[PDB]
Symmetry: D2
């Protein structure tokens, strides 16, 4: 029924680092044309582009449409952006899967992009401020990392899960280190090369080709991890080291019917066998993946034990351990090449980033069933089940 | 298979007018509850809330989820915002229909919301400005009304359509006045009452209930219309008078399978027979509805001649006329109670707004087949065909 | 030896009132032209322009020079601004007196001007704000009204004078209401028209002539004052009622040696016989007038009791009562036409504003000896003794 | 009559360099304390503090008073800031002299301070921006360096002087490199150590003592000056290399009557024999020094040829050479240790800085008469004559 013919992602950049002044639709563009090249499909055959992106303030009208056009997709196809926070990138793949399934389209490019670096500061000033000081709001924090019901940062929701699941600092720190060592190990062996599509940072006094995840840290020590101070709760347990970071990146999938891919001689990275999205208490949003995953599994007709590979977004060490602890899947098959803590977390692009990794790892190790899942701010989870062919 | 059980929209506010300090999700909340009460469905039965929103900068995390919770949809439900600019409000409805059609959901609330008044000013200031002025960009103008590829305002795209279709000032002015006249007659006759859910503007020095579209002008003259100066092209033909405005509002639909409405005793407002979306040149984006309306009819198996009622959004007189002229539908069944030039145009909500108008007008006149269509910035169009039950 | 040959002030404007968008330099130009006109002195005879001004942020390079150039003063002449906060407007006259006393100038235009309304909001952003919110500071609050040592507003130094001299709510309100009622009467009888020169506020849709003190309240009641809440100390005694306001005006005086006025045949408004400036504790800055008036009087060889009229600025009912209480001059010769609670307080202009009032009333009633004194933020005073010729 | 008993200055710092985050008043407090100390004068004997300062926006209420207080000046003394742009620091000394000359004070601390690195960005936002981007203005550029009559930078006034006097790139560049090599030589022989009082930059992770001018360039080459492009006129002649820079510093002088020095046993740095300030056309404001110097010499009874040492500020090479050309003084007695091109240009501090410089070279080489002079944007100049005792 609906398969992913090809996929591609840029390397994930560090906050104000390599993509510092690069607008998300520029990276978007690169990824959309990679997926077409990669499958052998022409720009002109795309019906629509669906990109999740949570922080587009100042980027101009519909940046999804700017990405498509810049990548060569003609003015005839359509494009749209969408937000389900951290779930946006994965969610977008299921929404183009739906576009094909209802017969509204034949070929979609779907995924997500995000420039946390380029997120602006803002103020509402139409009414004027007659007397007194006013705040200039960091939009990446307000619109992307602050709970809207309790007023605190995602990090505190992580702390709520820590306390609730009784996850000690040492246990989260342990998890962190592992994801770094695993991310580092996979980068060193070229495991991220199929998925990555080098992005050219158009310079003035030099153009730079970025093709490596710059946020992974080499030789991460437990000692360094245990000396960091808690970032959200002054006497807390979550720190910079065991939480994901602020990052830039884009990632996408090229979707079509199974039969179309076959008419084209394409060898798909997998078949979308199910997806699901479920809400949870916004206070412990990190638990998102538990209910979404299981639903996903139930709609596919699979048992947790059937899964050969799993990508469960590393928002915070606290929430990842809780996810794994509750679902019980075998830890060795989850985030095999590392996670967000090491790799980075470009909010709107993250769900399609983890899809890429899942998809290129399933191919390279011959796994047949996989699942990607993320926790979403505001209390939500998104999960998708993929089967190789 | 999928029907519109109920529907509701707030009145449309004037810019920096009645909803001048109201956050879009507030407007949204009210409409999610309204569609819920109107159909006798309880919030706890809502699976997901889908809202189109184009300018949510500063409103914090995913305003769609903040509107769903404010309305009382439990935290176990899901919510997301999407953006296909002007067609967002109608595309949400389509996207929500798909959720039920693929069996991912049973009940969906969908439409759009917008607070153009509350759109902030912004600046990318992470680097630091070492010397010189810097701009504070109005996100309303940059993210909602400025072509991203040509750098000019929608008004200019209108002008291109004017010139191209050879639509003179008087013909554009004539259209506008007719729109005001029809919207004003509709207003006095109580034609807007069913669709409108009164919104309470929570005050300090008193509460204010708004239940009337405040941008419609009473007794609009042709003389006043002909004295205005061109707004975009210094020696052009589009004016403030023959273009839509900048406004705030929200509007939605409670969607469910026809079998489900029937198990509940609900008398739906319509059956979704088909929807379509197509791209066109961004420079003449106002031509968008032509291809998209025709696609939709084709998918529905209908002839233009089969339509009993049409709502084709009035971004600008020149594009409205070109659309009508090209499609050839009978002017007398298009925007029977007036259009966006008089009612206003709250960007993300405008398609759900027009869907409400269409749906309450088909029920009161007993029309059987209707279409809603809108042009989209960046060069796109969206249309949806509805059949009464 | 140095006389004030002529003087003029604009009407004082309400905060964001008549002069809401008129830069201070436009108002001092009209006052420069009026002093010249009023003493039969041409602009090519001016040696230098000295204008007190506390909040010139954003107006451009040296607004004293922009006033002088606008009034037609030759480019050969010089001009500078100075700032001793609320004593600025009077100090200036004292400083222009000094340039002729030491032989460096013959003819000076001295005084002050201020647009509190045009004061901007600001932030030091050269270093860059990595992330988080940051304050946009009101410069009129920060730079003109807050004590730099103690961190609280001028209104709390008022509270400190009230406690310390034990001034009740009631005594302060009566002082307040007597200030509005004497100023309304003087306005209604015409006593402000000789000192005010009309200001033209360049319109687009109309030029407006402003020749009346708009902050003065007509029919001010004891009751409405008595109902006010304390503004600075949630449970104090200074309110908006008994404190001066935030305002806009300019005011000046034209000086020359007495020998030079006799050579041109001008009948001067008075002789500067002495001035004095003295510090006090910043915490009771309201007391400034006491030692500064004392010292002026001793330098003039006069007894408090030799004075015939006195203008003692009303920063706050509390400090005005304290000052009158200690000096012990006959209250019936103080502010006979009302003071700053009713007229307003445009900070850098105020001392020239009250000098004007002093001068014109000395002339109309034939007073021979006068004194003008203000309290200054940061803990200081300035006083000036004037005798008629 | 009035002498300079002692003087002192901080090292001048580079834009966003050593004093990047130090408010102006801190640097003035250290110089107020160093002139007290250098003359055996205690702070309690200080009657008034006079500081030139052009850009104090956001520092709070009257920084002159905040530096005085920080230096321990009693709260019984007074303090005020003034603004005659570039001539501020030296005009202050002249007005402090006047204070003693007319017997209103016996002891004054006078000079300037300026923190161009701490100058903020601002915007007048009281009336609000209904729609449309607005500028955040750099207060250093607008209030400091932009001519208010013509709208262009000081650099362009420099261009007008170069064209008018026909100074070539080459002669300007040679001027610049001789300024850099004279200051460097001066710095290395310890000629700046008597005048400089060390400033402690209070750190967190350590305190740094600054006692060296850091803008001086070591081994500045002609070739590096000749390859620069013109900064203000895309095809002009003024560059960053031949203009002064953006800088931070403070500088002052302690003043008293000659008779009082003599009763204290002080050996003063010189006697102020006269000053003058004269206006010129704003467009060629760099020529300010010509008439102001001629007037001051006239007032002293001195011929150009009687001077033994001159400091003539180096705003720009072009205006410096024009001034030297016109005046005709021997170039070897001008800026003998370098000028502002090398040392920097902290606006309000500059004239006190170059005075410092004059005074310590006149004592070290035993020069009897000197003059200090600066060009002032808006079209002005100040000059001051000094003789040794």
């Amino acid at each position: 029924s609906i398969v992913i013919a090809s996929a591609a992602r840029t390397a994930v950049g560090s906050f104000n680092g390599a993509f510092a002044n690069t607008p998300a639709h520029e990276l978007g563009a690169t990824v959309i044309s990679a997926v077409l090249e990669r499958a052998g499909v022409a720009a002109g055959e795309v019906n629509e582009v669906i990109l999740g992106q949570v922080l587009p303030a100042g980027e101009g009208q519909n940046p999804a449409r700017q990405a498509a056009m810049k990548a060569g997709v003609p003015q005839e196809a359509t494009a749209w952006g969408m937000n389900q926070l951290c779930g946006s990138g994965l969610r977008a793949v299921a929404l183009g899967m739906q576009q094909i399934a209802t017969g509204d389209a034949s070929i979609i490019v779907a995924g997500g992009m995000e420039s946390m670096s380029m997120a602006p500061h803002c103020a509402h000033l139409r009414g004027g401020v007659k007397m007194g000081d006013f705040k200039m709001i960091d939009t990446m924090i307000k619109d992307g990392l602050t709970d809207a019901f309790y007023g605190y940062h995602m990090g505190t929701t992580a702390e709520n899960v820590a306390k609730q699941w009784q996850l000690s600092r040492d246990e989260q720190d342990a998890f962190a280190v592992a994801s770094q060592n695993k991310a580092e190990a996979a980068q060193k062996d070229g495991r991220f090369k199929d998925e990555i599509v080098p992005f050219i940072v158009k310079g003035r006094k030099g153009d730079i080709t970025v093709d490596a995840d710059e946020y992974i840290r080499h030789g991460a020590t437990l000692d360094s991890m245990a000396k960091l101070r808690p970032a959200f709760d002054k006497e807390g347990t979550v720190t910079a080291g065991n939480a994901s970071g602020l990052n830039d990146g884009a990632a996408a999938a090229l979707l079509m019917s199974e039969a179309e891919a076959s008419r084209r001689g394409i060898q798909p990275l997998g078949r979308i066998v199910s997806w699901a999205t479920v809400g949870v208490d916004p206070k412990v949003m990190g638990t998102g993946p538990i209910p979404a995953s299981r639903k996903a599994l139930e709609r596919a007709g699979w048992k947790i034990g059937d899964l050969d590979l799993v990508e469960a977004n590393e928002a915070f060490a606290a929430q990842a351990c809780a996810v794994n602890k509750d679902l019980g899947w075998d830890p060795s098959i989850v985030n095999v090449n590392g996670g967000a803590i090491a790799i980075g977390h470009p909010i709107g692009a993250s769900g399609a980033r983890i899809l890429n990794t899942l998809l290129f790892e399933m191919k390279r190790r011959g796994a047949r069933k996989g699942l990607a899942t993320l926790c979403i701010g505001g209390g939500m989870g998104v999960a998708m089940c993929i089967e190789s062919l």
